[PDB]
């Protein structure tokens, strides 16, 4: 049937507890000796029935110093030119760690410069370090909260600056956009960035020392970071600023009205308009080329030229609603997450699918390191760390 519970969530990916560390193996071996000293005082029959109808220990390499894995690269069918080798493409993802947040995850950030991981849920932000050699982690370096400030406040989004010195957070009932300082000897809140009666749901930072956000009612506000006064206000339709991309001098905005707008900061006026067949759920911009990537609600991946602005072109059609999108540091491949248990990778020139990795449930967010070595993906309440094999 294509009727109620029509083959929904029928399978289940039994996640492995992933013990493959030699040090842990030795520790467990030494530990069982105490138990055995204290103690003193399969397949059934596989007869004539088909089994194809669904109803030497291997150790993973550790993440040395929380930076690299120290292995050897895969072979290629042919050699590559110097320019050809300048850009590489992944081939597989190997899970190395699991971070145990205690609540439903909303946002993740990495900043591999300082080897940290920030996980943001609706109650607070947990900070983890990647140098802790453990199969699964359940004790963060810090746990920032803001609930005690007011009666009942929610957190929606968090942002990490490019130079890894400032953290931004925004939510529903807060009196502002909280700012934390990361380069100080102590982890403390610095500014407030007032936004009295609005829900943030989107944040962005600009290299000219300015911050900006796009609220639910369509308002896009810009603040000066060094003095915390409102610089500019822009207004659009409701539920039309759920995504926000900043470029050299333009703001690209997309939301649930299926319209892509381009605000110009000098004149504070809309310069472009475009319609789409479904709601825009994700936006991204390539770091090297002039391509804007749009992930629609009906499963379409669309590429748009941010300079020529000639026309859009659909590359790949996923089967599920896209929630997250990000480009590689060299702008040669992208990753996509959605509601369909899979993390997908696509190449740049044509959007051809490279590989997939199953997950336990709807994947809401993910992030990538600046050196293109790790991928953090948070599905239900745990953030999984993946090492990219080139």
């Amino acid at each position: 049937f294509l009727s109620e519970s029509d083959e929904l969530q029928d399978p289940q990916p039994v996640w492995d507890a992933e013990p493959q560390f030699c040090q842990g193996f030795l520790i467990q071996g030494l530990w069982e000796l105490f138990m055995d000293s204290r103690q003193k005082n399969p397949r059934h029959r596989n007869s004539l029935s088909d089994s194809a109808d669904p109803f030497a220990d291997k150790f993973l390499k550790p993440l040395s110093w929380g930076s690299e894995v120290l292995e050897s690269s895969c072979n290629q069918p042919s050699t590559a030119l110097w320019q050809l080798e300048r850009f590489t493409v992944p081939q597989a993802l190997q899970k190395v760690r699991v971070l145990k947040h205690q609540e439903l995850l909303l946002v993740v950030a990495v900043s591999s410069f300082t080897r940290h991981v920030f996980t943001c849920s609706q109650s607070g932000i947990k900070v983890w370090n990647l140098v802790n050699q453990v199969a699964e982690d359940r004790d963060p370096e810090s746990h920032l909260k803001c609930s005690v400030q007011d009666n009942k406040v929610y957190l929606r989004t968090c942002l990490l600056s490019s130079n890894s010195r400032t953290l931004f957070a925004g939510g529903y009932n807060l009196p502002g956009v909280i700012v934390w300082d990361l380069a100080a000897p102590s982890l403390y809140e610095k500014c407030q960035l007032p936004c009295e009666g609005l829900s943030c749901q989107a944040l962005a930072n600009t290299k000219e020392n300015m911050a900006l956000a796009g609220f639910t009612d369509g308002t896009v506000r810009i603040w000066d970071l060094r003095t915390q006064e409102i610089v500019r206000n822009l207004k659009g339709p409701t539920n039309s600023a759920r995504n926000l991309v900043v470029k050299d001098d333009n703001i690209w905005t997309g939301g649930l009205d299926a319209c892509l707008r381009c605000w110009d900061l000098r004149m504070a006026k809309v310069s472009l308009e475009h319609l789409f067949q479904s709601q825009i759920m994700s936006l991204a911009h390539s770091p090297t080329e002039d391509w804007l990537l749009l992930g629609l609600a009906n499963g379409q991946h669309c590429l748009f030229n941010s300079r020529k602005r000639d026309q859009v072109l659909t590359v790949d059609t996923k089967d599920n609603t896209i929630l997250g999108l990000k480009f590689s540091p060299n702008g040669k491949w992208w990753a996509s997450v959605g509601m369909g248990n899979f993390i997908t990778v696509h190449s740049m020139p044509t959007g051809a699918k490279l590989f997939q990795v199953p997950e336990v449930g709807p994947v809401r967010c993910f992030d990538m390191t600046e050196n293109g070595r790790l991928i953090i993906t948070g599905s239900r309440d745990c953030a999984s760390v993946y090492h990219i094999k080139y």
Binding site: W65, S67, F113, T114, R115, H116, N129, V131, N132, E141, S142, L182, A183, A184, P185, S186, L187
Partner: protein, 89 residues
């Protein structure tokens, strides 16, 4: 018999166990360190390594301790060596 230092929160506790120890001339090291903390903290943040300089030695020497992962230790060591060579020459 006791030395105190401020450990920034972003520096992991796992990397205070295998320091790099070296010795230079105190006459260089005094002007190497200077007086204030601003650019010292900035350099520590940039290199992701901690630096400690002591002068309580045989009388004219500089005991230098560098913390962090080997890449950071190497970066700080090269910075110190190059700047000391430029000072002496």
């Amino acid at each position: 018999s006791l030395r105190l230092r401020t450990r920034p929160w972003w520096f992991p506790i796992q990397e205070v166990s295998n320091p790099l120890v070296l010795y230079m001339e105190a006459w260089v090291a005094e002007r190497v360190i200077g007086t204030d903390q601003a650019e010292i903290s900035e350099i520590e943040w940039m290199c992701q390594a901690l630096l400690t300089v002591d002068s309580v030695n045989s009388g004219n020497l500089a005991e230098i301790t560098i913390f962090g992962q080997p890449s950071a230790q190497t970066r700080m060591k090269n910075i110190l060596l190059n700047m000391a060579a430029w000072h002496k020459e």
